[PDB]
Amino acid sequence: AIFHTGSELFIITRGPGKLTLLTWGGLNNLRSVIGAIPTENTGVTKWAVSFSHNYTRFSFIWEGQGEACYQIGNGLTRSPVGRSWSSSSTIHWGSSTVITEDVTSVVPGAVNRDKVTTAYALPDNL
Amino acid sequence: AIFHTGSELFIITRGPGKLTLLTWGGLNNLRSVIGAIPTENTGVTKWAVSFSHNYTRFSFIWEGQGEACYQIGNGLTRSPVGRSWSSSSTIHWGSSTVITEDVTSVVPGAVNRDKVTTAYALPDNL
Amino acid sequence: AIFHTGSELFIITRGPGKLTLLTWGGLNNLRSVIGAIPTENTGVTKWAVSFSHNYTRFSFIWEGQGEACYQIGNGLTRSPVGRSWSSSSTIHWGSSTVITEDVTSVVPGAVNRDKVTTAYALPDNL
Amino acid sequence: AIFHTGSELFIITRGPGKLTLLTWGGLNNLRSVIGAIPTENTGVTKWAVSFSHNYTRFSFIWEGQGEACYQIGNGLTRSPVGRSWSSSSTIHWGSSTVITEDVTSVVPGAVNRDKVTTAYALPDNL
Amino acid sequence: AIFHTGSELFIITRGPGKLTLLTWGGLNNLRSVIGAIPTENTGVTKWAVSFSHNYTRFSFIWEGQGEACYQIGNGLTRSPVGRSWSSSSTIHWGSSTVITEDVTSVVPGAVNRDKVTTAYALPDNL
Amino acid sequence: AIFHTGSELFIITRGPGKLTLLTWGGLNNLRSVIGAIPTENTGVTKWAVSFSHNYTRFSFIWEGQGEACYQIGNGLTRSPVGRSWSSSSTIHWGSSTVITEDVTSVVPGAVNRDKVTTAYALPDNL
Ligand SMILES: CC(=O)N[C@@H]1[C@@H](O[C@@H]2O[C@H](CO)[C@H](O)[C@H](O)[C@H]2O[C@@H]2O[C@@H](C)[C@@H](O)[C@@H](O)[C@@H]2O)[C@H](O)[C@@H](CO)O[C@H]1O
Ligand SMILES: CC(=O)N[C@@H]1[C@@H](O[C@@H]2O[C@H](CO)[C@H](O)[C@H](O)[C@H]2O[C@@H]2O[C@@H](C)[C@@H](O)[C@@H](O)[C@@H]2O)[C@H](O)[C@@H](CO)O[C@H]1O
Ligand SMILES: CC(=O)N[C@@H]1[C@@H](O[C@@H]2O[C@H](CO)[C@H](O)[C@H](O)[C@H]2O[C@@H]2O[C@@H](C)[C@@H](O)[C@@H](O)[C@@H]2O)[C@H](O)[C@@H](CO)O[C@H]1O
Ligand SMILES: CC(=O)N[C@@H]1[C@@H](O[C@@H]2O[C@H](CO)[C@H](O)[C@H](O)[C@H]2O[C@@H]2O[C@@H](C)[C@@H](O)[C@@H](O)[C@@H]2O)[C@H](O)[C@@H](CO)O[C@H]1O
Ligand SMILES: CC(=O)N[C@@H]1[C@@H](O[C@@H]2O[C@H](CO)[C@H](O)[C@H](O)[C@H]2O[C@@H]2O[C@@H](C)[C@@H](O)[C@@H](O)[C@@H]2O)[C@H](O)[C@@H](CO)O[C@H]1O
Ligand SMILES: CC(=O)N[C@@H]1[C@@H](O[C@@H]2O[C@H](CO)[C@H](O)[C@H](O)[C@H]2O[C@@H]2O[C@@H](C)[C@@H](O)[C@@H](O)[C@@H]2O)[C@H](O)[C@@H](CO)O[C@H]1O
């Protein structure tokens, strides 16, 4: 299952843009969260994308002119990230698969946590 | 503040061991989570450590013979991680610094999520 | 077009095994060539795969038990390599796409050039 | 012998320029090929240089202001590349050594395949 | 002891600046040496700092806008370097720690060997 | 001149062994120094070799089954290190080149400083 040790969610992007994570499907009516994380890098950025406990749905898109792909754990495959919410990259908690899913109706209701959500660009010096 | 874009929490470790994350201070009686994340690497492991929405305390320790340090964003400083829950590395949500705190009172009530919490070892091919 | 500058063919594998290249569709009555290139690496091996002048078809498989993917140029996507001749990774000269093609009818006529064909594992010190 | 598994031909260059490969000594009257491959990198470029089946001579030069060296396999030695066709770097099929050779008599006959010959710059994300 | 095998002195800096080394406490009235080593790198520079035989004191500072840290051997800790001679990073021969020492009284007697002392920036291609 | 900024002395080795430095040609009646620096590494080790102030001769050998080469600054060329004191790699202070020199006559009178001379293996975390 994605997010377990060995099945971590990594993203690789090229050039500048924003990776946005939608955290939703909250247990016990917990509020959905949406936050955009910018990169100004000209080249490749590597990213770690985390879940939050007590949520069952994680959806993400890339907004940038360059490519963006996800990798599961140390798997070799790198597959394109969704580029709009009607064809978002989505994980159902417990799934081993990223699917394409329309989450356009979830986005406006989510609390805005731009630059403070669970997706992180790795620096030059790690 | 740590966990904001630019102040991401990275850990570097040497040799095999377990990084354990205690997620606590949950809003509205959300249950605390404890999970250990193993590595078997003989050398260096790099890690990205995430928060979870709706929690306000994040405590971590390293259990291994080899060193463990944290780095904030692309800062050059690397400082040691705590090695037991009585001297845990702890972050209070909104703080810009890691402190040393005894969280032994929080551990017994935490639900075990070994290999499925918000700390991730970076693989060899990222 | 694959094999042109900017669209070089790279392979990424995990663990030991043989990458086997079938060079075929030769002009000027040229004999097809088949050659297996071994790696003994436990971890990730990166590879550069070249065409040969005067041939119009290039087909390859990974015979190892670990994962294998190809990357075109500095593209981010990495997609699985074929694992049998009936589902080979195949390039038609001039195409920008690696297709899946059955080349079992070509293999028996090819001259064996094991360890001496146009696929190369990159070393640890490049 | 160079181009066999273990004795792969790699180039290292600094700054922008063209690596040009002459493929000649074609069996059965096969047409010699010349093709220049550009790099615009300001720093180091690593390259993989392939042979073509049915040819028995491979000559290459670097036209760039910066340095250029070849490495055989995982050998540590890096030695300078020829900088003109009268002092080309040349491999005789079956040889274990790159020698200096004057191939100006071969170049005029060769068909131009610029940006489409068997020498490849490795990208930033391999 | 620092400068023994396993306890090599490395520095990590960000951005352009100069690292200066004061070699002093020479036996047999050997003259003290001071030399500044510049970098123009915009990003992270890694440095190896050597002692000289027959000296008992080694002091160093970083002059630059960006951060500077030292690391001992393959240890994970990175700690700040001194930024003026009144607060120098200093090693007493045989000591396992870097101390803060005011060596303003030593600096005038030293011979200037800018760009020719025993601290070295590591290049892009090592 | 070797050892000036831009012309730093680096070594690359494969497999386990020892790099030995002989510091001689001392001014001010200084005794010659010899010291072996071992590595246990199975793969490639990178090294920084420093001079000592007040000496004019620096001679080094690699004793190991595996290859060993030197590189000057960020130059691309890598050339073999001497494998015995009768064929040492030698630098005359002020020279821009490494020569071969027999220094067997210096060795017996040199003070032994094994694991404590000015040649350093670079670690995995730099
Ligand atoms: C183990 C796990 O992931 N369980 C998921 C279920 O979530 C747990 O449900 C029980 C109630 O039966 C408790 O509410 C528990 O707190 C829930 O776990 C918490 O939330 C999940 C989503 C994880 O983040 C977990 O680490 C956290 O402790 C869930 O109800 C079902 C269906 O959605 O999925 C289970 O996999
Ligand atoms: C913006 C933020 O991080 N706020 C923190 C407070 O948490 C929010 O509290 C409000 C009510 O005042 C709501 O309960 C809101 O849902 C809370 O935010 C959620 O939980 C926090 C911890 C973050 O994970 C956030 O992204 C998430 O939406 C919090 O009560 C106090 C505790 O000191 O800190 C505030 O910084
Ligand atoms: C430029 C090119 O790639 N052309 C391909 C054609 O191959 C050439 O065909 C001509 C006659 O039409 C000659 O036979 C020439 O030698 C051929 O080029 C040689 O072979 C090709 C496959 C490449 O390796 C090239 O570099 C080499 O010189 C080919 O016949 C057609 C049909 O397949 O494809 C053309 O793209
Ligand atoms: C095995 C090999 O490399 N052989 C070289 C000879 O080339 C082969 O010659 C035979 C005739 O004896 C056939 O014509 C065969 O198709 C030739 O092999 C082809 O060309 C060589 C150059 C390689 O690319 C090979 O993979 C390809 O199948 C060759 O005539 C002589 C000349 O130097 O060298 C032999 O090593
Ligand atoms: C082993 C060592 O570091 N010795 C230090 C002493 O220095 C040596 O002193 C003896 C006389 O007792 C000789 O003069 C000898 O040459 C000195 O060693 C030389 O200088 C030292 C600092 C090192 O660079 C060494 O490699 C070099 O050969 C020193 O006198 C005392 C007190 O400061 O410390 C000893 O550690
Ligand atoms: C600047 C330099 O490297 N000079 C070398 C000369 O060394 C200096 O010689 C004078 C007397 O003429 C003093 O003895 C002085 O202390 C010497 O400099 C010291 O030693 C040299 C080897 C360097 O380590 C230097 O940094 C240190 O201060 C040397 O006499 C001549 C001839 O060998 O070469 C000069 O390049």
UniProtKB/TrEMBL annotation, chains A, B, C, D, E, F:
Keywords: Lectin. GO terms for molecular function: carbohydrate binding. It comes from the Eukaryota. This is Mucin-binding lectin 1. The gene is cml1.
